[PDB]
Amino acid sequence: MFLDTTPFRADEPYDVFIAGSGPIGATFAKLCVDANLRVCMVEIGAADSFTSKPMKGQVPIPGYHKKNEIEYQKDIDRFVNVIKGALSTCSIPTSNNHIATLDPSVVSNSLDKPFISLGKNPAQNPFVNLGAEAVTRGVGGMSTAWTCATPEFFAPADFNAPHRERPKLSTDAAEDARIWKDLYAQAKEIIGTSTTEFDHSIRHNLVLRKYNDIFQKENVIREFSPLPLACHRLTDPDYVEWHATDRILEELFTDPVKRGRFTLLTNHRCTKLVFKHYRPGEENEVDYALVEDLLPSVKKIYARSYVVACGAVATAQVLANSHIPPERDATIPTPLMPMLGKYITEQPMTFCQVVLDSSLMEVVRNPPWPGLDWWKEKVARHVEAFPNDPIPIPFRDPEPQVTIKFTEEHPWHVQIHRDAFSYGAVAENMDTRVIVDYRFFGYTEPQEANELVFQQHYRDAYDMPQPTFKFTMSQDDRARARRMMDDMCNIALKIGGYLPGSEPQFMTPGLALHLAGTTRCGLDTQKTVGNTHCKVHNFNNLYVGGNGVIETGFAANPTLTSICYAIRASNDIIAKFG
Amino acid sequence: MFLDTTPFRADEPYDVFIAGSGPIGATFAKLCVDANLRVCMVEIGAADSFTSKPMKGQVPIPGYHKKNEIEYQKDIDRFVNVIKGALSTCSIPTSNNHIATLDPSVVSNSLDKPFISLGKNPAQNPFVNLGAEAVTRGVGGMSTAWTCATPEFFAPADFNAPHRERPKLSTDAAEDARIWKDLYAQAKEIIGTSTTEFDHSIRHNLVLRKYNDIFQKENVIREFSPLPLACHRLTDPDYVEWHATDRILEELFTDPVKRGRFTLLTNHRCTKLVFKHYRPGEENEVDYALVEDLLPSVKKIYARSYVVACGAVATAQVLANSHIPPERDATIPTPLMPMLGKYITEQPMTFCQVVLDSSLMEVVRNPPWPGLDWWKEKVARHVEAFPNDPIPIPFRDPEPQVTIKFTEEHPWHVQIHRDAFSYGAVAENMDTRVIVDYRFFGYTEPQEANELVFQQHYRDAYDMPQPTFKFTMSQDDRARARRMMDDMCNIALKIGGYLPGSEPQFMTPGLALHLAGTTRCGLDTQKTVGNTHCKVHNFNNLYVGGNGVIETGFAANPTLTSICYAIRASNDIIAKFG
Amino acid sequence: MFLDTTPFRADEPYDVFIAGSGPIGATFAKLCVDANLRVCMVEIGAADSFTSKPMKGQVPIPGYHKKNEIEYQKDIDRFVNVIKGALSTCSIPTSNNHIATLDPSVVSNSLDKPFISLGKNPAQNPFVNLGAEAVTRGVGGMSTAWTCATPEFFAPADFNAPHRERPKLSTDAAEDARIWKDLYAQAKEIIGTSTTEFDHSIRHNLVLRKYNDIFQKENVIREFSPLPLACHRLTDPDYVEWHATDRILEELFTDPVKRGRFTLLTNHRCTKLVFKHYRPGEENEVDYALVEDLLPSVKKIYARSYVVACGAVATAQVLANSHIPPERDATIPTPLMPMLGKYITEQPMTFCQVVLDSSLMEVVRNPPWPGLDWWKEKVARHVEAFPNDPIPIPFRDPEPQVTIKFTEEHPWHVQIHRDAFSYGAVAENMDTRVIVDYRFFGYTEPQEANELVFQQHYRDAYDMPQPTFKFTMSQDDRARARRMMDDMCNIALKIGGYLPGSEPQFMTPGLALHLAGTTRCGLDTQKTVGNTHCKVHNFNNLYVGGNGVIETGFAANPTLTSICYAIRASNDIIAKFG
Numbered sequence A, B, C: 001m002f003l004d005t006t007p008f009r010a011d012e013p014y015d016v017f018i019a020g021s022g023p024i025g026a027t028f029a030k031l032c033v034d035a036n037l038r039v040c041m042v043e044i045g046a047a048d049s050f051t052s053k054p055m056k057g058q059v060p061i062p063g064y065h066k067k068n069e070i071e072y073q074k075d076i077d078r079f080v081n082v083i084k085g086a087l088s089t090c091s092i093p094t095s096n097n098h099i100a101t102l103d104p105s106v107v108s109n110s111l112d113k114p115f116i117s118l119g120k121n122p123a124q125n126p127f128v129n130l131g132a133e134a135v136t137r138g139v140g141g142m143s144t145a146w147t148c149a150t151p152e153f154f155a156p157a158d159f160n161a162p163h164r165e166r167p168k169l170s171t172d173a174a175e176d177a178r179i180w181k182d183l184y185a186q187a188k189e190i191i192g193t194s195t196t197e198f199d200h201s202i203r204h205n206l207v208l209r210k211y212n213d214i215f216q217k218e219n220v221i222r223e224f225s226p227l228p229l230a231c232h233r234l235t236d237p238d239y240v241e242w243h244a245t246d247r248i249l250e251e252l253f254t255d256p257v258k259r260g261r262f263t264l265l266t267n268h269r270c271t272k273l274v275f276k277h278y279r280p281g282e283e284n285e286v287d288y289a290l291v292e293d294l295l296p297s298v299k300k301i302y303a304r305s306y307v308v309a310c311g312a313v314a315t316a317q318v319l320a321n322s323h324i325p326p327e328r329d330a331t332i333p334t335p336l337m338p339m340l341g342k343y344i345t346e347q348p349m350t351f352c353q354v355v356l357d358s359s360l361m362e363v364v365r366n367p368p369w370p371g372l373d374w375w376k377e378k379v380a381r382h383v384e385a386f387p388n389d390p391i392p393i394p395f396r397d398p399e400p401q402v403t404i405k406f407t408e409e410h411p412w413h414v415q416i417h418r419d420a421f422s423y424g425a426v427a428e429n430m431d432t433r434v435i436v437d438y439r440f441f442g443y444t445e446p447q448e449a450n451e452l453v454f455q456q457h458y459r460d461a462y463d464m465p466q467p468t469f470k471f472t473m474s475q476d477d478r479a480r481a482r483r484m485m486d487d488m489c490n491i492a493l494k495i496g497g498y499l500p501g502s503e504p505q506f507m508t509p510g511l512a513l514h515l516a517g518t519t520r521c522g523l524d525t526q527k528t529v530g531n532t533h534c535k536v537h538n539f540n541n542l543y544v545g546g547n548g549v550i551e552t553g554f555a556a557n558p559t560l561t562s563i564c565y566a567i568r569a570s571n572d573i574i575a576k577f578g
């Protein structure tokens, strides 16, 4: 499927070239096209997911949320399959395990002759990996499948605190605050953030109000709030529209004026960028982008500015690949961008599910909180239709969406909800109405030694250099992780008992996919890849984008914040190339 | 194995008949033959476990602990098989499940013609079952494989606090107190309790010392103590001799005079007790013991007194079956014993394994507690010998054997140890030195409705009336169990992190095998089956023994306390028929 | 467990010393004590199971088959727990697998600092292993759990046909047959082979006759027979008594003349045989035998003749360990016995279980063969007692015990039975009355390269050199294995459909425990260790016992044949040491 956007023309240079049709990549697209810039966007995957909008006879819009389709609203459990089908794992270490019970006549690996597994990475030490780190390919990137939770990152009162989630945009605290407030407001409106979309679910209120009551009668008080979600409940309240790249790009299809300033080539790989020259430590510039059409031909695409917004892993993979101008575990040296792939950070996650205390069904039948006439009605109604239901919760009552915002007191991010990305077999003997998920995300200190590198002699499925992780938690990273488990166990048991198979546990490293710091951006030029406008040092026309630009160790979901950097970088591009 | 001993003569009535050769029944055999009484005992199982002592020229002694064979002293992880191989589940409920992948030509169950499978129990409602409750059949009862923990029960300083572990034997606090002091001291000499057999284990001291340090300095203090065990470390400290029936029955085999007053019938089913009459409300006598030889032939056995020490399940069985002189799901009425099998109790259990924090390995290499030369010495030798090993604990170092004494403020029993009865897959990759178990056993309130009954028309593999359980906890039982769960999680996470697979979980009801109150003995005549000497109401020559005489809701392990009731009962016997 | 038998003299030269109290070891002790020789037996394990046989007043006999207890007869399923608890794996290879969901704070293996685990053998190539090869320690050895099948090994009509199961004991055709004939008859009596103990099973007759019927109609005909079992049905037909060491040793406990020439040292390790000298290829002799009492210490033990009957592993172990008189993957060289642990052979095994055809319950309700009125009556009584039962077969009916004897045109051993040793989760949804096990066993050719060797630097749990396997079957063994699997599928599907979970598969190499050839004996002196009398080359008081003696590639269960060898051997100790 091939979008009939503006057709590529050669040697009439674009204003902005953009790699990646993720929500971040889309943000550059919307804002630059808003500024009457002419934009060419490439995307390695396909246009896989559509919605329609009237022109200003209807216009397909790609990058829609696959969870939006009605079969996934009627049957949420089925959706984990789309996710598993979307995700491609970055680094799978090789192995040579012996199958003892093979028919002795069949082909078999030996000690000195293991199989040669295509795609698996011979350089990956399995002990320093992010084994569950993975990527999605397609218009909209990971946004056609995401959870849609968009908190702000935490800013401590002391601007010089030992730790912060929200990175510094300036050395002036009054000014730092100022920009972030503006960036945050805008990103929220871009992506469709709301905290009221579940204010009429019985489960959501049950879990939220009770936790608040419980934790005011405590030594340490904890504050429970609605997880900020990028979504809006639809006029039929059985349904929700989850937001994705579609609402960002919307007007680039829907507005004939803007539609002419925007090109999107799907199934196109940005292989690398070619520079004016290849000398470290002195001013430089992107000459063109090596784009390859993957449909079963090679293009040099010119533009006045360039954005790599291919997700945290791939963005670095392009800039790494670009170091090759046109023993066996050797990596590609990136001296043109020394800080590339250093200080990488990824969140430990703990997980469990509980079954609500039967005590709380009483609550459901007779809630002590006021202005709950809707709840009492839905309940009273349900028990009409189903006199013999153990659970008085209405059949299609939405899941809880509760969070606890980070504090330096409890330096981790908590989600109390139901996620579409189940981690095991659906518990078939327990009703879904009484299951609650807990996911606690920790943060990790940025250190130089923690690296994402790229192999010279190893290529992934798309002919790009193989990513290799070298990640080891720090000692205070581990103390915090432990405190986080404890916190989860305590908190969850306040309202339920662990649902068997979903007991307290750490998930495989990288599972959260909040990998950050791969092309990191901030005020310290020496240790970053880019400045606070996400411009790459020594390159006038080259910008990065995505979670890889985040220079801090943070616990919350990164997208909203990466959109802030997209706004900021887009404005620098606009102010330089208008 | 027909034990070479004083062969059965049916022309000299015995002083004592005992059914059951457990540790509780053998407590009778030992005390009674000590007092020149002449004793006949039948065991329905076989004599399979032996050690050999010199006569007071080597006499084989039965009821020796299976864990004492060197094979198991050197490979403890193998002993779980012995345990599983000796456990015989009591009530397996019927099922008729569709197997959709049968070759369609093979014998199959259908909806209306379900399989009839020998042994399972059509009366059991699975939701009130004690699914894991089971029995061992053989000389020693369960003692040939038990884990050997022998704590005392808790008595609140208030002799009238609303709940107590230790049952009352008098209404005077001081007399009651004094009786128990005496009973416990003998029992521990009979069973060979000792809290010092692990005092030179690194793993044991690490857990104990660090746990106490942590909680000496915490908001709510908790004291950790050596778990009292019925065993002793031999003089090659790698070996422990676990104690069982053999140490109790010992004299009766080795003293040529005690030889002659003791008859032991193995593979003999005490089918029932015949009375002189079967009217309820008035006095009565055990006429004789109806007893069968099960290997290739029925034997009335007359004696002056009769003791049923047949475990908590089989003891109620024999009595129930004795209500028969010599709607499909109707039970056997017990009018001669009005409260039999009523008021039963079992303990809720939670469980998890952790791996020790790696910072504690630093502690092992360099312990913060003064004057622990022997610890530094063992550690030094190992690091000398296995310089490479990431664990500084020596190879054959003993497990931890730590407890927390029940308190009314924390109404459950903990064990922080390593148990031979492992609960699932034996961890392939994790080193066993750094693994620690947690078991928390709660208590349940004795309630009338909580029953144990027997079927008229359903017979187990030994032709005895089929047990059926009708057990439901109470709301307060439940509330405590949640707190017990919360508490196991908080405690374990202080020194280690959950081993995947052994995360916080409740076990199947009855796995403790601490079933109790099937033949309850106490002061209130109208609610008990026996008195404080464990003579059945209205039968002057009939005594009960084992965990089922215990009338309280308790959380600690029961064997030691039951031995206390055995002694008290053996005195009441002797001071009658002596 | 020290036995009552004849004292230990450190002055007297015993006539014969024996290592190992398995069936082979017990056979030497019988035939030799019979011929008036004083014999010392040392066993490394304890005395686990006993029975009582009156003296020529009950005497305990060690070596009782553990399945004879009424427990494992009223519930055969439970017995695999005993088998698993008994087996100790010979060679377990090391590994360093990454646990990816460990709490990050806990102790962990790493890439270059893995766990050091007691009992893993670092020299083992997992690809050339017999990973299921295991030993059993105790009096009776493996005979206290064995399946008791005792077929004869195949002798082909030609005497120089390329392959035979049965080893050559002469170059004279007529004489070979004669010796084996009387050896077999003698052996059959010692252990007690009977092909008639299942002649009144409904299940056994159904399978036997139907298969024979069906296969009389087929293109290549195959003959089915009762599997020859070392057992006898007890006078009660529900119970069966499996034979074991106890019936080889009975005389030596039940005759004072006998008992007075038999010393039994359980828990005693025969560490090595010390020799006169150590010159390779020159007549030698044992001097003494080194023995360790493993109880809470060395012991020199003196006799004229010495028998090693420790298994096929532990036997060849013992001899190699003797090569040490009184890089680090290096192994103990055996220059005195060049062929020790070479030409080793083990049997591939295929397995499956079927559920019987529903069409066969009609054959059961109405069987078409002459003289089956006993069958009809049982079916009538069952159907009368159990109306609603789809299974006309009665509740206690013995399992099948059917074989097809090895032939040259189908060169594998086949068993169509029910084995106590289950291979995975017992299915709880299918009735065991219609389940049938299939175990085919192939044979591997002896090649010199196929080795069992012993580590100079790694010990097992009993301080003996770690055993190490170097085994790879040849292009012929593989091809035969293929036809064997095919033959099994074809044959099994004639009467039922594969039970789910128990579909056709190969089992882990070694699982059959018919390892042989470690100490091979024959008429080529160079390619053997001992001769046809089991007398080790160049040693005049040195004999070997067990499956290790068998020099050929065989597919049948080997104990009977080895028992033959233990007779031919036991005679040659008597005609030399008369």
Ligand SMILES: Cc1cc2nc3c(=O)[nH]c(=O)nc-3n(C[C@H](O)[C@H](O)[C@H](O)COP(=O)(O)OP(=O)(O)OC[C@H]3O[C@@H](n4cnc5c(N)ncnc54)[C@H](O)[C@@H]3O)c2cc1C
Pocket (backbone or CB within 6 Å): A019, A020, A021, A022, A023, A024, A025, A026, A042, A043, A044, A045, A083, A135, A136, A137, A138, A139, A140, A141, A142, A143, A145, A146, A147, A148, A149, A150, A268, A269, A270, A271, A309, A310, A311, A312, A314, A315, A318, A421, A513, A545, A546, A547, A557, A558, A559, A560, A562
């Ligand atoms: C199941 C799931 C749930 C999630 N839930 C949340 C959440 O609740 N909150 C949150 O903040 N985040 C969440 N995330 C993560 C979130 O989606 C990412 O932070 C976000 O998608 C990043 O946007 P991006 O455009 O920078 O990168 P991406 O979304 O990865 O998009 C990059 C695009 O570039 C394309 N590309 C890659 N390489 C090339 C190349 N060489 N040439 C051309 N194109 C290329 C890829 O195909 C992809 O389409 C979730 C992710 C997943 C998978």
Ligand SMILES: Cc1cc2nc3c(=O)[nH]c(=O)nc-3n(C[C@H](O)[C@H](O)[C@H](O)COP(=O)(O)OP(=O)(O)OC[C@H]3O[C@@H](n4cnc5c(N)ncnc54)[C@H](O)[C@@H]3O)c2cc1C
Pocket (backbone or CB within 6 Å): B019, B020, B021, B022, B023, B024, B025, B042, B043, B044, B045, B083, B136, B137, B138, B139, B140, B141, B142, B143, B145, B146, B147, B148, B149, B150, B268, B269, B270, B271, B309, B310, B311, B312, B314, B315, B318, B421, B513, B545, B546, B547, B557, B558, B559, B560, B562
């Ligand atoms: C693995 C395991 C670990 C344990 N660990 C502990 C622990 O650490 N601490 C603790 O306090 N408890 C523990 N227990 C429980 C403990 O073993 C029992 O409480 C104890 O053995 C009770 O002894 P008893 O004589 O009352 O009953 P039993 O030991 O069960 O003895 C009953 C005997 O009676 C025989 N019998 C039954 N019916 C008949 C019949 N009608 N005719 C003839 N004979 C009959 C049976 O064969 C059996 O031999 C453990 C149990 C197990 C299984």
Ligand SMILES: Cc1cc2nc3c(=O)[nH]c(=O)nc-3n(C[C@H](O)[C@H](O)[C@H](O)COP(=O)(O)OP(=O)(O)OC[C@H]3O[C@@H](n4cnc5c(N)ncnc54)[C@H](O)[C@@H]3O)c2cc1C
Pocket (backbone or CB within 6 Å): C019, C020, C021, C022, C023, C024, C025, C042, C043, C044, C045, C083, C136, C137, C138, C139, C140, C141, C142, C143, C145, C146, C147, C148, C149, C150, C268, C269, C270, C271, C309, C310, C311, C312, C314, C315, C318, C421, C513, C545, C546, C547, C556, C557, C558, C559, C560, C562
């Ligand atoms: C579950 C099972 C089922 C089987 N079924 C069959 C079957 O149906 N048919 C068949 O033919 N075979 C069967 N076998 C194999 C059969 O058990 C053996 O072939 C048989 O026991 C051979 O006995 P052995 O005495 O030669 O060796 P073992 O029985 O292994 O006995 C050797 C003894 O030597 C002792 N020993 C070893 N080292 C030392 C040491 N140095 N010091 C002192 N003592 C030592 C060991 O403790 C052992 O007890 C089965 C085996 C198993 C495990």
Ligand SMILES: OC[C@H]1O[C@@H](O)[C@H](O)[C@@H](F)[C@@H]1O
Pocket (backbone or CB within 6 Å): A147, A148, A149, A415, A419, A421, A439, A511, A512, A513, A514, A557
């Ligand atoms: O794996 C699920 C988790 O993945 C993360 O990427 C999301 O940000 C969370 F919201 C989500 O719960």
Ligand SMILES: OC[C@H]1O[C@@H](O)[C@H](O)[C@@H](F)[C@@H]1O
Pocket (backbone or CB within 6 Å): B147, B149, B415, B419, B421, B439, B511, B512, B513, B514, B557
């Ligand atoms: O399941 C094991 C448990 O069994 C129980 O019977 C014992 O009392 C516990 F101590 C033991 O840990």
Ligand SMILES: OC[C@H]1O[C@@H](O)[C@H](O)[C@@H](F)[C@@H]1O
Pocket (backbone or CB within 6 Å): C147, C148, C149, C415, C419, C421, C439, C511, C512, C513, C514, C557, C558
């Ligand atoms: O594994 C079970 C098998 O063990 C083998 O050692 C026996 O010889 C077979 F008969 C038996 O079926």
